[PDB]
């Protein structure tokens, strides 16, 4: 709900986008998780996608000052065969 979706054919690579609303000119570090229960900054590369890669992912951008972070979610649906 309100979460964007990426569809990719199986065995293709995908660069999953970081949907955190980040600040320009801040040198973030990025950390990605899968929630179980390319010129775009901070994307997650997933090579040779398979059906099991489908799911909801969360990016978290950490401010270098260590006092702030920002997170956004994206859904991946793998649909080739």
Helix (H) or strand (E) holding 56: strand 55-62
Resolution limit, Å? 1.8
Cα 8 to Cα 49: distance, rounded to the nearest angstrom: 8
First to last CA, the chain: 27
Domain housing 69: 1-81
Q: How far is CA 29 from CA 4, 42, 56, 58, 68, in A?
A: 22, 8, 20, 14, 11
The method recorded for this entry reads: X-ray
Q: How many CA atoms lie within 13 A of 75 on its CB side?
A: 8
Please tell me whether residue 48 adopts helix, strand or coil conformation: coil
Kindly write down the DSSP assignment for every residue of 23-42, as one continuous string: PTT---EEEEEEE----STT
Contact between residue 15 and residue 74 where contact means Cβ atoms under 8 Å apart: no
- CA–CA separation, 32 and 75 (whole Å): 13
- Looking at the 3D structure of the chain, how many domains does it have? 1
- Please compute, for residue 67, the number of CA atoms within 13 A of its CA located in the half-sphere on the CB side: 1
Cβ pair 80, 12 in contact under 8 A: yes
């Amino acid at each position: 709900p309100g979460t964007p979706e990426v569809k990719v054919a199986s065995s293709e690579d995908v660069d999953l986008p970081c949907t955190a609303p980040w600040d320009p000119q801040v040198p973030y570090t990025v950390s990605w998780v899968k929630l179980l229960e390319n010129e775009r900054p901070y994307s997650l590369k997933i090579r040779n996608t398979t059906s099991s890669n489908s799911g909801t992912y969360r990016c978290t951008l950490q401010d270098p000052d260590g006092q702030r972070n920002l997170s956004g979610k994206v859904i991946l649906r793998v649909t080739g065969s």
